Amino acid sequence: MVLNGYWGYQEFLDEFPEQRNLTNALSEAVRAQPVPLSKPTQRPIKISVVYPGQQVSDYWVRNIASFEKRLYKLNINYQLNQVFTRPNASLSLMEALKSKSDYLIFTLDTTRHRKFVEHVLDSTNTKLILQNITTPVREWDKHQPFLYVGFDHAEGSRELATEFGKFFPKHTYYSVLYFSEGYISDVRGDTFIHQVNRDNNFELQSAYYTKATKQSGYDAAKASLAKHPDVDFIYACSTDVALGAVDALAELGREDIMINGWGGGSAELDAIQKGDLDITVMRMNDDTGIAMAEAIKWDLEDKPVPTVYSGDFEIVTKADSPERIEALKKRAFRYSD
Amino acid sequence: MVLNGYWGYQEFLDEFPEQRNLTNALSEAVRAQPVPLSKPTQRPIKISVVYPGQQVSDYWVRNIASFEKRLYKLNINYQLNQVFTRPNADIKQQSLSLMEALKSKSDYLIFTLDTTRHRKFVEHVLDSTNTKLILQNITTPVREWDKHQPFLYVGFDHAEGSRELATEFGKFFPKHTYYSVLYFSEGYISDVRGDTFIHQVNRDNNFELQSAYYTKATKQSGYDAAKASLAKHPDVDFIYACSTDVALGAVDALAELGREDIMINGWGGGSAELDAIQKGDLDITVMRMNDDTGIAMAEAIKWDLEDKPVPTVYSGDFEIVTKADSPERIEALKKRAFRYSD
Ligand SMILES: C[C@]12OC[C@H](O)[C@H]1O[B-](O)(O)O2
Ligand SMILES: C[C@]12OC[C@H](O)[C@H]1O[B-](O)(O)O2
Ligand SMILES: [Ca+2]
Ligand SMILES: [Mg+2]
Ligand SMILES: [Mg+2]
């Protein structure tokens, strides 16, 4: 719908019914009580994670939390090698190849990632798990990685777009704060822009990329409003960006402007309950960490493993009752607390 | 007695009889049936909880579980905010993310106190705010705060439990027994838990410490530390682990290495520990009557809402448990310890 060379999550599942069967099976295995590993391993399995560090978004740390906890509950012996990638400056600390890991948990936002993934796929025996993407790549139809896991960007963005198009009318002005340049921005961003422009006839005033930090969100917001102060809402593509943007609106005295979150972590939820963030799409966070454990389990039991898993979203607005937020938290952080 | 600047738990109550009286009272109210809130409140009280997450030890989870249920049974409206703490660096992310929840303006704040990093924050909370402060998992008041003590120190006394362990090891093992120590991460816990055991066992029983290592407070770290230790000193008769996760990592390490000769303990007696005890992989432990400290916090908060004096300190009770204890004994102990957390 927005990028060429990918399967839609649902498109994938519709094209390959077996994959729907597996992904459903995994969904159910992710919901039900832990069923421990049925095949003792001779030694620990070496699992390596590379994740973006020091984000205000708690997605990753909660993902590892819920992952490790489900691993433990499943009675799987492992060694976890975690890498904290400082907020951008190298990436050649993808030296976790030297680790000779059994499972590699990584991301795919840029091309700098693509090249490396193709390296991991065409060279090693290491099973690759791609977090925060759920739309498989067509070029890899012959050898797809072990699993794509996350909360589908297109869907979560679609739901937001829908809510905005429901609240605001035709010819509503808005600006967009992207993530850093890459896959996330393209999907999270252009999905919203296309829906809202073509279905609801809004008028995009401007759009800017950020450095994926709160500071950058703040700066970018300010610049955007300096150039186009007359918008009805800003659409942010991520937690930190949106939370910087919130400070920008606060400093500029612009309460007229609506702003969204994206993901519904703890920070966003506090902001929403404060009224600083107006709407968000909230991912049932722990499901994906728990899904990775289960996938790994089946693999060790020589059961077939789905290629894709996507977790559920819930729209959350500042008009929600604290009861609702509490229940969603109890659902979403049932492992990471 | 292994650190300076701290009041002993018994010493403190020996110093202040009214303080003992209050603590005895709290114990009584803890064991007895719920006597629900007298003076009701206009609003639901805001409580901010800062706990470490992601561990095999079920102490915190069960503490919360029991706390909320005793709160319910006392009928007190409350909102309960769990601040996610990432043991992942850095000090200045933690610090700000701790400062985040003081603009939350909570009635009560539940915290830990392990690092010097925590000290500065606690001191800030105490020096500059109205928020009533409950320090979980510490039972020895800081002498430098005699001007203005926290609302409550609550937990199970590290020195007492370590002594009990030290005594059992002292009873079983002869003089000149070689042993190694796995600490928690650096801090107050490691200091008391580790050095109380080391001092008692070295000085009273003439044991010999072969080595000692800090961990990162995780099971994997306990495993790595066990391996490293036994790599450098394979000749030890037992390892003394300073926490559940560390202990359970060490257990897997001793499994992987094939050292069934080396004895090893837990520290806390949670579910994982007990299951390991009964499996025979863990040898002895000091089990705490878990839910008492959760029920205590709940009471202290009640008494406060009724404008009654609350004791500065409360320490829950301990029971030694070995793999030679019958399932019945284990079941009685579980029955007591987990009466609320199930
Ligand atoms: C996972 C994530 O996607 C990009 C960034 O890593 C996170 O921020 B976010 O919370 O907006 O979702
Ligand atoms: C509460 C606790 O003390 C330190 C650590 O936080 C927990 O693990 B434990 O089970 O050893 O008890
Ligand atoms: Ca010492
Ligand atoms: Mg575009
Ligand atoms: Mg506003």
- Smallest Cβ–Cβ distance between B53 and the set A43, A54, A337 belongs to A337
Q: CB-based contact (8 Å) between A69 and chain B?
A: yes
Q: Taking CA atoms, what residue in A is nearest to B86? A: A61
* Distances, alpha carbon A131 to alpha carbons A50, A52, A106, in Å: 10, 12, 6
SS3 B50: strand
Q: Which of A55, A103, A56, A111 is nearest to A82 (CA)?
A: A103
∠ CA A143-A149-A153 to the nearest 5 degrees? 110
A179-A183-A188-A194 Cα dihedral, nearest 10 degrees: 120
Ligand 1 neighbour A239 (Cβ under 6 A) = yes
Ligand 1 neighbour A306 (Cβ under 6 A) = no
From CA A289, how far away is CA A335, in angstroms rounded? Answer: 9
Q: Are strands A279-283 and A313-317 parallel, antiparallel or unpaired?
A: antiparallel
From CA B157, how far away is CA B153, in angstroms rounded? Answer: 10
CA of A312 to the centre of ligand 1 (A): 15
Residues 6+ apart with CB under 8 A from B211: B180, B181, B229, B232, B233
Q: CB-based contact (8 Å) between B86 and chain A?
A: yes
Dihedrals φ, ψ of B142, to 5°? Answer: -80, 125
SS3 A335: coil
CB B8 within 8 A of CB B157: no
From CA A72, how far away is CA B318, in angstroms rounded? Answer: 27
Dihedrals φ, ψ of A292, to 5°? Answer: -65, -40
Domain ranges of chain A: 1-150+284-310+333-336, 153-283+313-332
Chain B closest CA to A268's CA: distance in Å? Answer: 13
Q: Are strands B284-288 and B318-322 parallel, antiparallel or unpaired?
A: antiparallel
Second-level CATH architecture of A1-150+284-310+333-336: 3-Layer(aba) Sandwich (3.40)
Instruction: For chain B, report the end-to-end CA distance as a whole number of angstroms.
Output: 35
3-state DSSP helix/strand/coil percent for chain B, to nearest 5? 45, 20, 35
Element (H or E) spanning A245, and its range? helix A239-252
From CA A250, how far away is CA A276, in angstroms rounded? Answer: 8
Burial class (CB in 10 A: 0-12, 13-18, 19+), B52: middle
From CA A106, how far away is CA A124, in angstroms rounded? Answer: 15
Which sign does the torsion angle of CA B12, B14, B16, B17 carry? positive
From CA A326, how far away is CA B158, in angstroms rounded? Answer: 34
Q: Residue holding tokens 């200045």?
A: B92
CA of A242 to the centre of ligand 4 (A): 19
A190-A195-A197-A200 Cα dihedral, nearest 10 degrees: -160
Second-level CATH architecture of A153-283+313-332: 3-Layer(aba) Sandwich (3.40)
Q: Are strands A308-310 and B132-136 parallel, antiparallel or unpaired?
A: unpaired
CATH of B1-155+289-315+338-341, picked from 3.40.47.10, 3.40.50.2300, 2.60.120.200, 3.40.50.300, is: 3.40.50.2300
Instruction: For chain A, report the end-to-end CA distance as a whole number of angstroms.
Output: 36
A22: left (phi over 0), alpha (psi -120 to 50) or beta: alpha
Burial class (CB in 10 A: 0-12, 13-18, 19+), B174: exposed
Ligand 1 neighbour A244 (Cβ under 6 A) = no
* Distances, alpha carbon A42 to alpha carbons A76, A77, A292, A311, in Å: 11, 9, 21, 32
DSSP B158-208: HHHHHHHHHHHHHHHS-TT-EEEEE--SSSHHIIIIIHHHHHHHHHTT--E
Contact B79 A266 (CB under 8 A): no
From CA B311, how far away is CA B59, in angstroms rounded? Answer: 23
Burial class (CB in 10 A: 0-12, 13-18, 19+), A31: exposed
Residues 6+ apart with CB under 8 A from A187: A2, A3, A135, A153, A154, A157
Q: CB-based contact (8 Å) between A18 and chain B?
A: no
From CA A185, how far away is CA A177, in angstroms rounded? Answer: 9
Q: Residue holding tokens 């979150």?
A: A261
Chain A closest CA to B13's CA: distance in Å? Answer: 36
3-state DSSP helix/strand/coil percent for chain A, to nearest 5? 45, 20, 35
From CA B315, how far away is CA B135, in angstroms rounded? Answer: 12
A1-150+284-310+333-336 with A153-283+313-332: one CATH topology?
A: yes
∠ CA B108-B110-B111 to the nearest 5 degrees? 140
* Distances, alpha carbon B7 to alpha carbons B11, B149, B340, in Å: 6, 12, 31
B158-288+318-337, CATH topology level:
Rossmann fold (3.40.50)
Burial class (CB in 10 A: 0-12, 13-18, 19+), B12: buried
